[model samples]
Target: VVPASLSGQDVGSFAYLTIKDRIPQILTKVIDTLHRHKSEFFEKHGEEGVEAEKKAISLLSKLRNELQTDKPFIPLVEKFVDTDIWNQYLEYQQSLLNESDGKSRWFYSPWLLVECYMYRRIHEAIIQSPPIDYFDVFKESKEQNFYGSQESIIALCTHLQQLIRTIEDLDENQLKDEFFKLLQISLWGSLEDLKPFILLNDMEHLWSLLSNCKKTREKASATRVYIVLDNSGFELVTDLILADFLLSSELATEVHFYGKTIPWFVSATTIHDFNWLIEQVKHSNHKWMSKCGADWEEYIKMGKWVYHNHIFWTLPHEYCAMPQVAPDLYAELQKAHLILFKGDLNYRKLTGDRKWEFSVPFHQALNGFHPAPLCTIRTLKAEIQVGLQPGQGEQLLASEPSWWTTGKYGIFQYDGPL
Candidate 1:
């Protein structure tokens, strides 16, 4: 069931505490980063570099307070800190906002552009300060421990293997029910706040679509599935389960897991977490690893598990603009058949999670940006819903005005031709 609201004074208290606890250190790192680059900013922008740093620092302090109190509105904080393209996009958004005819709306502003800018700015705050370091604000708490426990990994893996075997034996008709159960179980790990919708009438339609896709499969070939990691704990488990399904079913030839390069709460963007997953499953006590009944350690040794924690993958970096900053990653995505973006934050990034009209199609919400076939599996954790059938969205609005804002309605949204 969707929770009425997130509890704990920690929501507000932690907001303030996060700034107080982390801003100073982040600022010091920002300064040091500038120095290490040997006045790279000065070389590029001349005196503007100094001014940029100063403005960024000031903005950061203000951001900290805003985050703490959830007050004194600052729209530019996420824009600046989430990605590298903020400055230019910020200017563009301002120009649009200031247009005389008022022809432009927030939706016209590129969601990807602003998101990248926000994270970049946050990175600047950390790197330019002191005691040069990278902190994962989005670390996965469960995966962190999962990596440390061999027994847990083995048990989970064995459970998954059994599930895979059972699924393989099921006929296409039976698989429909199986899919629903899997979807429900998958959500169970990560979406406690959203009310279960397994029985929703629409799910039958979704199941039909899934079944059609499977039936039409033309001699499965090796396909790479990119899962943009999000959140720790249950979400991570959900991702792992999905990955296991893909691999065991021979649906995916290889899997490339992309995580954040720094601490991004709830997102796997660190090499530490990536390596931890590998280490956990390779241990002797790993029952699933033993079930594989081969040199599983060799897979770990050979790094069959591809983990990419590039600085650009983090929300703080430009996503769509990665072609400019990380061309290699951009190129790799071109080869993938599908990219599964998990959890709420990634969904926010995908659609900009802004207040769009409920009637807008999901593809339109993305505004013609297609990097690859992508599917977003997320619970309603914020106020945004697109691609609803006629009156479906409105019905929810009437029955539950706050449905989109809480985890009340479970969502499995996909946009694809890929």
Candidate 2:
């Protein structure tokens, strides 16, 4: 049975607060982005493209109205190239309606559902527009943010290569330690909003789990590491370097990466961003960047680094629902030895976005959602967190009231179900 869904109705809830405040502001900016690029559409695609641009803008304007007015949710009528996934959207919407007594109004339904539906509606607007149907409304913002961080990207690439080459005298313990060190960098980054200490660090838990995986699979076959990724740009590069280290050092023989199937969730990585990142690194003047780029290309070519996507990733369903709604994807996951979920959204979904007690064990909160021995490298961007020492959450609130909500802290929480 599906667990009770997280709603925005709970007072002091992140989902509630985000939907009521943050999402509308984001939607407005998305519409503004569309308007910002009208001249480009006209210049390239001519009159038909300009007409499509206007139509897309009109649709988004209507969508913004429906969301703000708390109107009842509507099923997507957008024609998708993949019809089955679009049908799943209707089914998922109906599932929401059945629970809300056939009325899942905006801000009244599950926060994940409504928020994801809003993006889908925005995507529908783009799709219904011809000539400009393939436009990514948020591309400009992603590219801008990515390019703005070039210095850091080059620095990170340089450092990662240095570690992989220089760490020759490493024993087993040191190797595992460096693993989480790189893991932490990819998760929290070198941002001022973060600190070295996690309120509760479970890095050792994954170390043992993955070490056991290595022993169990030793000399049998590759230890496949599947990463459920978060953002693009700097975060994407960090993930690649980490994966590169995993392969170069024989920590794992293969690493499979998953990304969004469409433009999604503000700054999430999709295949387009994935390719652009590789291309940017491929032509880089930095020696380390060029070397990593060529190696990643070879990894892809040789199948040491594989990329796969299933539409279920784009859906609002949490990991617990993976078997019910996306059995094939769930089944595919069983082949891997370890699964690493990056960033807050994947963490939220992994734990069902529940209102668990802060001291609850992470696996218990998972509530049988264990697809594999999984771990998450997430900064605390949202409110729902599990697997903490007693009083840890309360202490964080007492010390720096906004600590849990800020990007200032993170955890390498792991769940290794026997």
Candidate 3:
């Protein structure tokens, strides 16, 4: 909650408009989605489920009203294991409060704080009720997103699998070339969409960082990669594909995946989402889909691919505070040769959610939070950014002021760290 170099709530800031306008609509959508699920709940869990559904809908509606009314945020007293994280987050918000207003309120607080808080508040609504605890409110949208894009997912796996097949006879040089190309595709695939393609690349910088690591990967299992995941559906499938490519190519000996411990931020990946992804591919009729599943199963069995979660990911703390606040998790990330942060929120946290001048060198904005060589494949879903050239942001703004939110433009920013 450092005052953004520029205030987020000022008129021109997307963060301003997001907190004022976008978030309320999102809360309304969640309320509507929950309200509509009563029939589904009754059908699956009968009378008890119906009761739970009603209760959850009631709680969520109250939350939406509080948000829209600009009420002060509250501390969680829930039974969950991670309640402390939520309360601690509220504390962080409190620290950001003005002298006139002691507690952090919805509209007056930082935009990121309120937006991320909404998701956790939604989670708490479910956690308080055992009957609904296992249910994913966002599950329907996640499945629809994937099923709607199944054709693209299938074709991508087929094409990538085809590329992998064709490279079996290629020399190391060629293999590295193919690896670099596909790894990048998977990286940007973290933010895939149906929109016309455009890439604002920093690829060679990434290759330079990984070039030596490539040689190391061949010699031993020394090179490890960690992916902090985002989104779901097709976006996630591509991440899995990249993980596969990393493993099969031996560009990485082990790949660690970090996802939300709880259902999170609309489509942010969770352990359940990861498992759902596995089951979806495992049962698919398509050969490539099944192959990807089989490979993943073996990867899990061999202990070459791993998954982890910390409550901090669901909280609003920026990465600069990670080593202090979630030191164990930070220490683990330090072990990776490369760590890839997928999508916008992680990118926001990576650069401390500051309103950095668009061209501030990424490292300076990072404020010394390097844990490992890091790459972020983020589509601009918010205005905060780093590692831009002097005029890149203004140029983009002139051409498309709303480009940051469109999911069209992307960056492959890298910071080489030990």
Candidate 4:
């Protein structure tokens, strides 16, 4: 049975902290970001842009005030694609509470629902203030995150170059080992100290699936792998390198990337961020980095690496609702040989952000959400998790009480779509 969703009402819990402190900070940052770019907005949209900036800033400030004061979640008013769906979700949440007040308050509602709503509300502020409607509030921070991790990116590119150079000579076992190494690298991406912290690794299941596809199908294998990406900076580079290895080794014929439709969760990848990364890496001074970037662009041109942004990704609904809520996206994923869900937000959604017992099976937690043989490589950032051995979580708790939120632990859990 599914447990209650993690919510801010759980006083002192991570969800509470996020809603209480972190979300307000994020709104403040967005307000500051808009103010700082007032001149740029004016340059692009003239007096209209300047007025839009003020309106956006004022709306965001008001949103923060509402959040801090524990105001009821409101229906989205913008006539965007997913506006109705968002309002419907709010109604559904209201139905769940069945309260006399007939509203879902910020601190009382599900954390996932409210947090996703907060980001969408940020978009609403922009949407209402036209001329700056296309603006990405989180763009600068995402790029800065990428630029700050340049040394690590260069090292990874060099490693990939070495592997590509020697691929012809490596036997099957060697290839498997190389894949394992890179998968591990992708799992921890710049968090070098957490290599041993993977709690529920299933990389072998991944290797088995891809290896069998390549061997049994030979030239007939049209193994498509979907990577539902997370962050846009160094973590993104790691994911790309993983996809590159899969394609270069013929483990996957096509790699489909799923990104956010709007500026989401601050650092999450948008289509613009995806394209910007390629351009940035292509012009980098580092040899291997630039070469890798150039190669990635060709992969895009030849249609082997495809990027897609669907509104469903940015919605508040848990993944279990994918088939009913986003049938087209669900159908697309069903065609994949494997689906790799990157990072913690995805992991949270995959598990429905519930308070499952630690020993619960990954598939059990998924609750029929799987669209394909799916794998998640997430460094634990939220308190929600599952698939640990009995007492394993308790042992972890005794030592590092906040282990789940520390980014010190990770998981490489896999489940067959069935």
For each candidate, what is the lDDT?
0.53, 0.80, 0.78, 0.91
Give the deviation of candidate 4 from the true structure as CA RMSD. Answer: 1.6
Model 1 lDDT, full chain set: 0.53
Distance from true location, Cα of 43 in model 3, Å? 3.6
In the range 195-311, model 1's lDDT, one tens digit per residue, is 444212244544544445445667744566778786554355556666656555555556777876665543443667655555554554655655542333343345443666665
Predicted model with the maximum TM-score = 4
| Alpha-carbon RMSD of each model | 9.6, 2.6, 2.9, 1.6
Of the candidates shown, which would achieve the greatest lDDT relative to the real structure? 4
Give the CA lDDT, 0 to 100, for residue 274 in model 3. 89
Per-residue lDDT tens digits for candidate 4, residues 1-418, read: 7899899888989999999999999999899999999889878889999999999999999899999999888789989999999999888878888646457988888899989999999999999999899899999999899989999999999999989998989899899998988888777873445656888889888889998888887675599999999999998999999989998998899999999999999999999999999899989988999999999999999989999989999999999999999999999999999999999999999999999989899989999987889999899999978888899998998989899998878888999832
Q: Which stretches of candidate 2 lie over 4 Å from their true place?
A: 1-4, 81-102, 190-197, 215-220
Give candidate 3 regions above 4 Å deviation.
1-8, 187-200, 217-220
Which has the higher TM-score value, candidate number 2 or candidate number 4?
A: 4
Q: For model 2, how does the per-residue alpha-carbon lDDT over 334-357 read when each residue is reduced to its tens digit?
A: 988889999988988888776677
Candidate 3: tens digits of C-alpha lDDT, residues 76-165: 878787788768778866886679866677766767677778888888898776687787888888888888988888888897789778
Clash number for model 1?
A: 46
| Model 4 misplacement above 4 A | 100-102, 190-193
Selected candidate, larger TM-score, 1 vs 2:
2
- Pitting candidate 1 against candidate 4, the one with the higher TM-score is 4
| Candidate closer to the true structure by lDDT (higher is better), 1 or 3 | 3
